[PDB]
């Protein structure tokens, strides 16, 4: 069964720039059924190229593709923001179908820190029997960023869960969310709730903090 | 406008069974083979079947036996009918058209297949407002966090759909068979409290529909 490979798995590009992706199979295929598509976040995929090097509809001029054997590219002539996307290679010429795993596109863009905001449990949720405290970090550059959390000033590893924005549409930024939950008799037996964030826009953590007995 | 609509998507136990459709229009269907598709959660794409104009069908060893194509060129109807399903089976389902180099030049929008013995269950809606004590300055984040539900999806706007811009609305996670997400928005800290906040969270599966309006936190 063909494998495809596809490089990198990541990768960032800046507007403008010459950009070139793999697609590499385990085994020699044949280049008339070796295709290309791309899918927008929140999008179904799209026919992008066929047949190695053909463009399918609607696709601008900057895209082209090449290879042979087991040894495939696309390239983008100058990356534009519209551009951001998965782009997956798919061979047919053997029996089972298979797809590469995708090469994920994003856009360069100048670094922003984020903007970190904590918040305290709700009387409604406390009701019910439990306690959630949700920090979010929005809107930062570049995407790699590190939360942790500390009750009563030690560090909490367990009962966090987080999950990450797509890169931004409309300003090219990534945003993400903490959030720590305890049972209420836990989140009782403590003071002190703090979630910082470690970024390369600041050579110190954002701190944000709160008291179970403020006012 | 040649289109593939996919309908027929949902949950179901491991071991249950259940059909997808695809209508097709805008193209003579009877003259092309025709394809299912699917997407993991982990964002990979996978061949599910093929089946000629003629009805010839085709599979992967993964649901050989268990899934069966079919199409009523009449109808300009493809369906897929899965059973023995398991938890590996989750995926949103696209419908393909093929083309005769094996390429896919037409897809459907997807219909969502959650195979899971978790049970329906309605979100809680929980505010998140800034502590008693939080110092201002200029935008304010508000937030509403969205627990507990089962299955996906939600949606979630703000204002009935008034307030959009400034609004992160996170991806879902799962533990211990319940969903999680949260929401949050940005407004000038002037127009808050002033210019009422609410979250509206609607969960089709449960028939639920709530609004939790984000009052600020007080002695
Ligand atoms: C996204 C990829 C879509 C591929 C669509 C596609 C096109 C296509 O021509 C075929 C497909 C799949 O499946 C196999 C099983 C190779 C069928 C063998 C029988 C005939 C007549 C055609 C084959």
């Known amino acids: 069964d063909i494998v495809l490979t596809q490089s990198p798995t990541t990768m960032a590009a800046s507007p403008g720039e010459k950009i070139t992706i793999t697609c590499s199979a385990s085994?020699?295929?044949?280049?008339?059924?070796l295709h290309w598509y791309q899918q927008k976040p929140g999008f179904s995929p799209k026919l992008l190229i066929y047949?190695?090097?053909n463009l399918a509809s609607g696709v601008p001029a900057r895209f082209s593709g090449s290879g042979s054997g087991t040894s495939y590219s696309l390239t983008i002539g100058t990356m534009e923001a519209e551009d951001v996307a998965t782009y997956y290679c798919?061979?047919?010429?053997?029996?089972?179908?298979?797809f590469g795993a995708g090469t994920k596109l994003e856009l360069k863009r100048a670094d922003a820190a984020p903007t970190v905001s904590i918040f305290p449990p709700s009387s409604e949720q406390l009701t019910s029997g439990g306690a959630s405290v949700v920090c979010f970090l929005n809107n930062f550059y570049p995407k790699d960023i590190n939360v942790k959390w500390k009750i009563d000033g030690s560090e909490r590893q367990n009962g966090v869960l987080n999950s990450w924005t797509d890169q931004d549409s409309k300003d090219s930024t990534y945003s993400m969310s903490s959030t720590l939950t305890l049972t209420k008799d836990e989140y009782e037996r403590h003071n002190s709730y703090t979630c910082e964030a470690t970024h390369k826009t600041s050579t110190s953590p954002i701190v944000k903090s709160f008291n179970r007995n403020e006012c | 406008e040649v289109k593939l609509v996919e309908s027929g998507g949902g949950l179901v136990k491991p071991g249950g069974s259940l059909k997808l459709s695809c209508a097709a229009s805008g193209f003579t269907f009877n003259n092309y083979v025709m394809v299912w598709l699917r997407q993991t959660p982990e964002k990979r794409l996978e061949w599910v079947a093929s089946?000629?104009?003629?009805?010839?069908?085709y599979y992967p060893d993964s649901v050989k036996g268990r899934f069966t194509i079919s199409r009523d060129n009449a109808r300009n109807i493809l369906y897929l009918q899965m059973s023995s399903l398991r938890s590996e089976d989750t995926a949103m389902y696209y419908c393909?058209?093929?083309?005769?180099?094996?390429?896919?030049?037409?897809w459907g929008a997807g219909t969502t297949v959650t195979v899971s013995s978790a049970k329906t269950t309605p979100p809680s809606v929980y505010p998140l407002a800034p502590g008693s004590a939080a110092q201002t300055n200029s935008m304010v984040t508000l937030g509403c966090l969205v627990k507990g539900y089962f299955p996906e999806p939600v949606t979630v706007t703000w204002n009935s759909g008034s307030l959009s811009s400034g609004v992160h609305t996170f991806p879902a996670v799962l533990q211990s068979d319940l969903y999680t997400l949260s929401s949050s928005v940005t407004v000038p800290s002037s127009t808050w409290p002033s210019e009422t906040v609410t979250c509206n969270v609607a969960h089709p599966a449960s028939s639920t529909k709530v609004d939790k309006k984000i009052v600020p936190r007080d002695c």
């Open positions: 393909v058209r093929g083309t005769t180099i094996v390429a896919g030049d037409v």
């Open positions: 089946i000629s104009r003629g009805g010839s069908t």
């Open positions: 085994s020699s295929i044949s280049s008339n059924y």
């Open positions: 798919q061979q047919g010429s053997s029996i089972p179908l298979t």
């Open positions: 047949r190695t090097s």
